[PDB]
Amino acid sequence: DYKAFDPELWNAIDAEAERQQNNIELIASENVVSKAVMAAQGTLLTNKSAEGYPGKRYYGGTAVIDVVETLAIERAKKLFGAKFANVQPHSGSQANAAVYMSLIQPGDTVMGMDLSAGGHLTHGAPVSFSGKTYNFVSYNVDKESELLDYDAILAQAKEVRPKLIVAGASAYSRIIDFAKFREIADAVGAYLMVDMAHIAGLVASGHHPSPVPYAHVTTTTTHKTLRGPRGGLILTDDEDIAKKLNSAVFPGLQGGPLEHVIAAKAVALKEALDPAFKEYGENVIKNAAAMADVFNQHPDFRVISGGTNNHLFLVDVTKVVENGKVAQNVLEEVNITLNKNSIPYEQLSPFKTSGIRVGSPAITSRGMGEAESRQIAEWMVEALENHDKPEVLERIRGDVKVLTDAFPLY
Amino acid sequence: DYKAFDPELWNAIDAEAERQQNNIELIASENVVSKAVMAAQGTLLTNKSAEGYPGKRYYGGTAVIDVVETLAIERAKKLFGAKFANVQPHSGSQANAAVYMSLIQPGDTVMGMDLSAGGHLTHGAPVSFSGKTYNFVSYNVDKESELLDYDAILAQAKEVRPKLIVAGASAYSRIIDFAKFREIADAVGAYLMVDMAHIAGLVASGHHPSPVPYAHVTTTTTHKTLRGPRGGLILTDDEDIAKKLNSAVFPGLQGGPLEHVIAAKAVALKEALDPAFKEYGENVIKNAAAMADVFNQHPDFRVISGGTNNHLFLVDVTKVVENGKVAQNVLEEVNITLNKNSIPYEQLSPFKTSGIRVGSPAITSRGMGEAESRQIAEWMVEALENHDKPEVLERIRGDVKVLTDAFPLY
Ligand SMILES: *[C@H](N[C@H](C(=O)O)[C@@H](C)O)c1c(COP(=O)(O)O)cnc(C)c1O
Ligand SMILES: *[C@H](N[C@H](C(=O)O)[C@@H](C)O)c1c(COP(=O)(O)O)cnc(C)c1O
Numbered sequence: 001d002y003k004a005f006d007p008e009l010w011n012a013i014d015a016e017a018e019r020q021q022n023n024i025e026l027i028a029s030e031n032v033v034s035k036a037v038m039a040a041q042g043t044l045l046t047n048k049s050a051e052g053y054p055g056k057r058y059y060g061g062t063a064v065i066d067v068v069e070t071l072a073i074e075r076a077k078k079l080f081g082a083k084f085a086n087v088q089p090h091s092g093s094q095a096n097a098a099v100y101m102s103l104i105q106p107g108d109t110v111m112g113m114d115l116s117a118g119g120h121l122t123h124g125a126p127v128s129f130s131g132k133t134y135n136f137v138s139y140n141v142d143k144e145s146e147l148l149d150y151d152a153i154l155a156q157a158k159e160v161r162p163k164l165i166v167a168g169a170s171a172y173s174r175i176i177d178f179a180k181f182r183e184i185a186d187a188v189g190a191y192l193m194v195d196m197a198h199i200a201g202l203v204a205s206g207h208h209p210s211p212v213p214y215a216h217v218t219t220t221t222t223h224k225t226l227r228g229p230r231g232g233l234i235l236t237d238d239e240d241i242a243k244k245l246n247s248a249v250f251p252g253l254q255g256g257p258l259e260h261v262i263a264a265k266a267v268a269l270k271e272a273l274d275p276a277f278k279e280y281g282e283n284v285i286k287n288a289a290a291m292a293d294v295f296n297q298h299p300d301f302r303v304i305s306g307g308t309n310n311h312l313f314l315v316d317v318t319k320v321v322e323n324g325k326v327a328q329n330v331l332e333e334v335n336i337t338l339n340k341n342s343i344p345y346e347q348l349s350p351f352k353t354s355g356i357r358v359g360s361p362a363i364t365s366r367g368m369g370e371a372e373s374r375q376i377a378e379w380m381v382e383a384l385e386n387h388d389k390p391e392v393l394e395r396i397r398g399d400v401k402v403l404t405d406a407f408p409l410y
Numbered sequence: 411d412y413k414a415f416d417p418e419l420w421n422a423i424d425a426e427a428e429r430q431q432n433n434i435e436l437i438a439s440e441n442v443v444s445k446a447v448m449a450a451q452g453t454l455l456t457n458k459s460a461e462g463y464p465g466k467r468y469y470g471g472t473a474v475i476d477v478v479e480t481l482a483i484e485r486a487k488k489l490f491g492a493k494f495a496n497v498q499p500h501s502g503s504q505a506n507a508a509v510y511m512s513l514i515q516p517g518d519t520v521m522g523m524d525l526s527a528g529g530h531l532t533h534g535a536p537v538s539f540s541g542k543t544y545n546f547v548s549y550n551v552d553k554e555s556e557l558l559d560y561d562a563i564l565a566q567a568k569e570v571r572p573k574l575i576v577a578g579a580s581a582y583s584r585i586i587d588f589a590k591f592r593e594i595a596d597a598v599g600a601y602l603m604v605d606m607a608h609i610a611g612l613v614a615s616g617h618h619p620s621p622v623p624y625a626h627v628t629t630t631t632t633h634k635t636l637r638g639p640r641g642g643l644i645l646t647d648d649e650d651i652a653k654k655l656n657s658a659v660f661p662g663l664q665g666g667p668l669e670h671v672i673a674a675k676a677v678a679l680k681e682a683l684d685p686a687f688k689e690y691g692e693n694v695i696k697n698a699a700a701m702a703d704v705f706n707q708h709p710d711f712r713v714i715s716g717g718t719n720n721h722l723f724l725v726d727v728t729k730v731v732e733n734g735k736v737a738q739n740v741l742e743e744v745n746i747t748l749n750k751n752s753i754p755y756e757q758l759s760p761f762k763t764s765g766i767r768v769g770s771p772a773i774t775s776r777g778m779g780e781a782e783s784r785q786i787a788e789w790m791v792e793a794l795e796n797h798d799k800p801e802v803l804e805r806i807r808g809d810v811k812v813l814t815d816a817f818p819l820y
């Protein structure tokens with residue numbers, strides 16, 4: 001029994017297992033993976049150096065590795081309807097770096113969604129390799145509707161003439177029109193890359209239209225709504241782009257891939273291919289709308305864009321508490337975790353923000369329904385309204401514990 | 411029961427466990443990690459997004475994650491004697507990229523060891539981001555001795571004027587003088603980076619001199635001789651460099667770290683801090699030298715630099731078989747896996763090579779000693795000498811199964 005050797009590490013792991021059980025997880029990026037996904041990434045596949053690609057490895061004794069990686073590739077292709085897939089990127093960020101490396105050059109102009117409106121760090125932040133290598137120029141949402149305006153974006157693309165347009169977001173509640181993004185790209189001879197990290201599970205379940213037919217390349221995390229292990233994935237229908245993508249991932253950016261994690265990708269993709277996964281996506285949408293509807297109806301809260309068609313939404317909380325940061329800290333005291341989040345045209349410090357971001361996937365994976373989602377959102381309103389009344393927080397904490405005890409994590 | 415849901419995947423994982431058991435693994439980069447290491451990266455730590463650093467995370471619910479990551483940081487600093495450690499890099503390649511991003515700017519001149527004498531792809535290959543982003547100039551070993559010639563490297567550095575010198579290798583058998591590399595760097599006003607991936611377990615065991623007091627920045631994999639999970643690690647004594655490295659890893663190059671893998675790093679680093687790790691390192695050295703001695707004494711084979719003072723060595727096989735690829739294929743027939751390898755000043759195609767690379771770490775971790783290591787190298791000589799006699803290969807394959815049955819993998 002190995003755990004007696006290292007009690008400080010194994011006690012910390014027991015403490016994190018207890019924190020996840022005793023926590024209402026509303027961070028829109030989080031999920032609860034299956035025991036099968038965890039077991040695959042705890043295998044002796046970690047021992048094998050798999051530099052290269054199936055049948056084209058730097059080393060031998062890789063014929064079983066090749067079967068595992070090919071299952072992950074074949075499942076990604078089947079699940080997303082893509083002719084090519086690369087399952088080696090270590091993360092979403094590495095996936096994105098490989099696509100930029102394949103399609104554009106340093107100094108090339110790129111349009112990505114503004115970081116205040118849900119663009120990722122890797123879509124042009126100045127502190128990211130993305131903004132350091134490439135000239136990123138943001139598009140935003142409409143100032144009043146807080147929706148993407150495909151006319152304003154086309155007009156801006158004709159001025160900017162980007163080599164590449166990046167679509168996809170971390171904090172956008174509405175359906176992104178990939179057919180329109182491809183039209184905008186075509187009108188200026190740009191590539192279109194879609195980073196579907198937040199929405200890949202909903203793409204896989206049928207609850208969000210797929211970018212895969214419209215983007216020259218689609219990137220995603222295997223984690224978030226897809227409910228996989230942490231890692232990246234790249235999809236394309238173009239055979240010449242596929243060759244470039246493969247070279248960019250290895251030996252361009254990475255070395256040996258994590259074949260234990262790729263086994264876990266292959267596990268998670270077979271789960272998403274199952275009819276049960278459609279049911280998962282349905283509850284994800286229902287649960288998110290139920291929570292959004294509680295803030296919509298309360299007069300002291302505005303849901304950004306007025307609602308959600310996906311797993312998440314933002315709330316301006318500044319009427320009820322000073323900033324998103326305070327909202328986060330308060331809800332932490334009743335064992336509800338979400339994050340402070342900038343809202344569109346954020347006016348406060350990015351360290352404070354006006355917003356909270358809420359998602360349904362993790363509570364949905366714990367088997368919660370619209371009733372429990374509505375209930376969680378009522379608790380959130382009540383904790384924020386009573387942020388200075390310690391014995392009200394005390395009481396919500398107790399009510400939360402009855403709910404978590406009722407929906408065991410594992 | 412989860413295995414019943416996906417037999418194709420779980421059959422392949424069971425087959426890799428049995429393949430690792432029934433094969434003699436001599437790939438110098440491979441090892442057999444502990445049950446504790448595999449179990450740690452199979453935990454529900456994969457469900458927690460930990461963007462940022464301990465005490466300074468993007469999201470809440472990270473209090474326990476911070477204890478796990480801080481354990482990995484403190485155990486790295488203690489084991490390698492460094493004032494700072496970063497345990498987030500997904501891989502050795504991502505570690506190296508963050509160091510270049512910290513110390514130099516695109517187009518700067520870098521010296522790195524020649525890919526034929528053991529330099530990694532990330533040490534300037536033109537197919538790597540390293541050779542595409544930076545102006546790499548390679549240094550070699552001496553043609554006659556096959557040893558690093560620190561006077562010749564000094565004279566080249568004074569001509570080339572690098573901003574950065576990278577030392578460390580994947581096919582060099584002799585003790586590196588890190589004090590000499592830092593004297594060379596200081597003589598030309600360059601940074602010294604040491605990638606100690608191959609030798610890190612021998613630096614930990616006390617069998618190889620540490621680069622940590624001499625390199626501005628030390629990179630490593632947590633896998634290979636250190637016997638950790640697949641990932642990377644960065645060390646420095648310089649507080650200003652540490653702040654740059656941290657910002658380069660995240661948000662510079664990566665997003666969210668793999669905290670389940672970081673738990674596994676913490677497990678491995680505590681294993682390497684144990685007095686039994688010194689005995690491992692001693693057996694690694696003795697077992698590699700017992701294999702090298704078989705090839706040294708045999709007239710048809712030559713060991714690159716005449717032997718080894720670490721875990722690996724290279725053998726020119728071209729008097730017995732056409733090329734290293736042939737030698738790798740023949741040994742695979744008798745369930746011995748190693749890799750063809752370029753030898754210094756390699757004349758054949760890089761796809762063929764003159765050489766094989768042999769390491770001791772995997773067989774040492776299985777409990778094998780010097781008598782087993784010698785028997786293994788006698789079987790390699792016999793199989794290469796008798797490559798065209800199927801009845802000989804059949805017999806060695808049967809003798810190899812008696813040896814693997816006697817030293818079970820787990
Ligand atoms: C995930 N980013 C999440 C989010 O949900 O806000 C937080 C953790 O930043 C993400 C990624 C992540 O790539 P990683 O695996 O390197 O961390 C990439 N792309 C998008 C769109 C995204 O939401
Ligand atoms: C590992 N290179 C080895 C080798 O043994 O030849 C094989 C596995 O390519 C290695 C790395 C690898 O980084 P990774 O985690 O990105 O694959 C980095 N640096 C050195 C010196 C090294 O040997």
Ligand code: NA
Pocket residue numbers: 606607608609610611630631632633634635636637
């Ligand atoms: Na190592």
